[PDB]
A paper describes a structure:
EmGluRS was co-crystallized with glutamate, while EaGluRS is an apo structure. E. anopheles was initially isolated from Anopheles mosquitoes and causes respiratory-tract illnesses in adults and neonatal meningitis in premature infants, with a notable outbreak in 2016 in Wisconsin. The EmGluRS and EaGluRS structures are very similar and have a root-mean-squared difference of ∼1.3 Å for the alignment of all main-chain Cα atoms. Intriguingly, the glutamate-binding cavity has been probed to develop promising inhibitors for Pseudomonas aeruginosa [name]. PaGluRS has a similar structural topology to EaGluRS and EmGluRS.
[name] ([name]) is essential for [name] aminoacylation and is under investigation as a bacterial drug target. [name] catalyzes [name] aminoacylation: the binding of glutamate to [name]. The structures of Elizabethkingia GluRSs reported here share ∼97% sequence identity. EmGluRS and EaGluRS are monomeric enzymes that assemble with a prototypical [name] topology with an N-terminal [name] synthetase class I (E and Q) catalytic domain and a C-terminal anticodon-binding domain.
Numbering used by the authors: 2 to 418, 424 to 501
The structure:
Amino acid sequence: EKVRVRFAPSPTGPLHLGGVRTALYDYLFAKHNGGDFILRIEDTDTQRYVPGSEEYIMEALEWIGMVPDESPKHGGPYAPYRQSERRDIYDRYTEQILKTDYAYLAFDTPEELDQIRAEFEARGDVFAYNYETRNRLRNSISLPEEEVKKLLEEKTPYVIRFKMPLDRIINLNDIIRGKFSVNTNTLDDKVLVKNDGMPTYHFANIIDDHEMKITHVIRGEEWLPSMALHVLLYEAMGWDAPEFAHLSLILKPEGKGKLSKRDGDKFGFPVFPLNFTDPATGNTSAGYREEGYLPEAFINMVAMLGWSPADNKEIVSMDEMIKEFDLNKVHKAGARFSAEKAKWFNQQYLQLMSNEAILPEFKKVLAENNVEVSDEKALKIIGLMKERATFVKDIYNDGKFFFHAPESFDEKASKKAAVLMQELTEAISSLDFKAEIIKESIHHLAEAKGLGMGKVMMPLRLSLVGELKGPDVPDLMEMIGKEETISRINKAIET
Ligand SMILES: [Mg+2]
């Protein structure tokens, strides 16, 4: 009855958005049902290993707040949680499946397989090792029993392949995709065990899902064409298969096709949760985290790529998502990635942070730009700016007038927006430079003279900013102070 799910990334590079979503739905499904979330490292393909990938995965899950219950770091009752460390388990089950009619030995070399691939290509076809071709290749079905015996005495390298049944209809049932049927004649005699005795992912994963008592396999639709094989492997072993749920690939923001790093490089959004430096080129892809996406906003955005809670509430915490996540409500249709939505989520979460919660990152941005201000002023600037910001860095980049005087003045704004009025304003501001009192003084000057408030406010804004932007003028004057306010006014008068 206890739900057990597993996230099974390979240590072959960084997590993509699809992988983050799979991990999230694993976590939400396990926690919603009071079950267990397992991390199993799929490191049997030694030649695709990227140093630091396991550490990357753990750091990303920790950043988002989805720590596995069982993992290499935490241990657990079914350790080892790295597949490279489970060879004795795999050997036991390799011996078992070789007693069935579902597996056979194959001796074909890479050159021999390249040769038949070229023969098919010349006919405009694609080679598949399957029922149709296995009898003309070199394996324990096609070769005389005496030749196989001879080859094994000679220590000839061999793989173990699954023996696809002849003309059998497999009826599959997926939680996301529903019921469908597949004829085994469309499927291949996939390799189960490599030359060195280690399983391929197909065989390792069904062995370990069985051993680790996994109840629900949640994964991407890239695995869906292999589902029939996996169900047949459980049958071959005399085992009950878990339930499956196949998530449709995330779609491109615009046009046909699936989301790829090409879309991130062409549209300007990140593709990995954390910084990843490619070892081949030394170039670093900046992650969501380092680009300033708040983890609560990031994971809220990822959750909604194909799941819509019944209450139509878009902003939800991890605890709220745990309470209402229903795997049967995840859409079969692909969901388009939206950079707009990701930025909107970030803005929504940023606006609700306290000024104090924003201050550490804001001070980091200031330091990177060689700017220093008191914490008192920094908190006030954050309060004045955060409602319009999408990222904390925007509070500086769009508020440079808090720290730097204008050197020029926009001509269009200069034309739209006299020195006597400004001189008279300079005399009146010599008081308690508070925004509420400054505005009261400006209204007193406007009422004393014969002009509407904009006749004072607009040229004043131009003087302080160089263009017509920024927060309310009396707030800006309070932030930069009396001396700097008058300095900028006199500079604008002289210009
Ligand atoms: Mg369903």
